Amino acid sequence: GLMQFTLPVRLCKEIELFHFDIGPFENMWPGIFVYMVHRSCGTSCFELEKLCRFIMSVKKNYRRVPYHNWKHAVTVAHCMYAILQNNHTLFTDLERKGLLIACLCHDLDHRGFSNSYLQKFDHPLAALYSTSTMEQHHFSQTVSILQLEGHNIFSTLSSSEYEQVLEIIRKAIIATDLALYFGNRKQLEEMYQTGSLNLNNQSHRDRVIGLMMTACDLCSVTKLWPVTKLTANDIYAEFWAEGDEMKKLGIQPIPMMDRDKKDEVPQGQLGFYNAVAIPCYTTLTQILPPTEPLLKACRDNLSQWEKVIRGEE
Ligand SMILES: O=c1ccn(-c2cccc(OC(F)(F)F)c2)nc1-c1ccnn1-c1cc(F)ccc1F
Ligand SMILES: [Mg+2]
Ligand SMILES: [Zn+2]
Structure with a gap:
């Protein structure tokens, strides 16, 4: 109980900021996560020993792929941490x-x-x-790990609170399917503008949590430009590998995934910022005002890509 995890001064301060980068030292990531859970949730929400053992199994079950890896997981957890910490009073105990x-x-x-x-x-x-x-599949893997011996970090919850947390987690994971994002944001926009949005409507909270999950998932576009630009290399490494596997199946890939159309990346990013990222953090800033730094960082990077196309970088 009296073991407060502690980060060096620079991290201790910078971890509070939306645009924090967890850095290249893999063996510090688990501790960064535990620091966040304790500050966001409490040193009581989880038995340290089960939490550590859960984290390390979850790590094992991410793969050595260029983007969708353990580092992405911890990055997406930190963005949520920054949103929860900037909207203290809006979230229940189970939700956090x-x-x-x-x-x-x-x-x-x-x-x-x-x-x-x-x-x-x-x-x-x-x-x-x-x-x-x-x-x-991701949700399935989460449940499977929770069900390993000594891995049930939710052991102290009652049967009610246990089904409530797993359902929160299921909706949150399902919502990271970008195909579902567009419909969800439109309904949130319409609701917010007609003033029917009501955070006591469980069905409405579900939607708000979904949008937060999209925002966290896409948060490489909300970093300082060098991080955003270097993460894009890892994103396109996967898109281009899938483009190769499409051609092996005798299908021409969409240009996003065609490595022969590398030239088109900067324009392809403009579309994604205009069609996806900006609308995402705009509707989020409307519903959760203290998330405005993610909209502002995202606009700044849109501007940086506009500077790439114009030969100015
Ligand atoms: O930079 C990008 C360019 C294109 N797409 C993308 C992904 C999926 C459908 C898509 O088309 C449509 F616009 F219609 F959705 C575009 N995503 C990203 C991106 C930025 C940050 N995270 N991701 C991301 C999200 C993902 F979900 C998966 C991989 C990523 F790199
Ligand atoms: Mg995913
Ligand atoms: Zn993801």
Whole structure:
């Protein structure tokens, strides 16, 4: 109980900021996560020994792919940590408990391939889960780990609170399916503008949590420009590998995934910022005003990509 985890001064301060980068030292990530759970949730929410053992199994079950890896998981957990910490009073106890876990577990056992490729390859997971294929698998892996011996970090919850946290985690993980993002944000926008948005409507909270999960998931676009620009290299390494596997299946990939159309990346990013990221952090800032720094960082990077196209970098 009286073991408060502590980061060096620079991290201790910078970890509070939305644009924090967890750094290249892999063996510090688990401790960064535990620091966040304790500050966000309490040193009581989890038995340290089970938490440590859960984290390390979750790590083992992420793969050495270029983007969808252990570092992405911990990055997406930190963004949620910054949103929870900047909206102290808006979230219940279970929610704070489930969401950080859900963020750490949301891409479990990702092989670096889109749902589309799994469907076209005719992967067994595509027969097991017809929609949100990888996202149903990720949740499945989370439950499986929770059910290992000494791995049940939710042991002290009652049967009610236990089903409530697993359902929070399931909706949060399912919501990271970008195909579901667009519909969800539109309804949130319409609700917020007609003033029907009501954070006591459980159905409405579900949507707000989904949008937060998209915002956390996409948070490489909210970093300082060098991080955002270097993360893009890892993102496109996976897109181009999937483009290669599409061509092996005798299908021309969309240009995003075609490494022969590398030239088009900077314009492809503009579209994604205009169609996806900016609308995402705008609707989020409207519903949760203290998240405005993610909108501002995202606009700044949109501006940086506009400077790439114009030959100014
Ligand atoms: O930079 C990017 C360019 C394109 N897409 C993308 C992914 C999926 C469908 C898509 O098309 C559509 F616009 F219609 F959705 C575009 N995503 C990113 C991106 C930025 C940050 N995270 N990710 C990301 C999210 C992901 F979910 C997966 C991989 C990523 F790199
Ligand atoms: Mg995913
Ligand atoms: Zn992800």
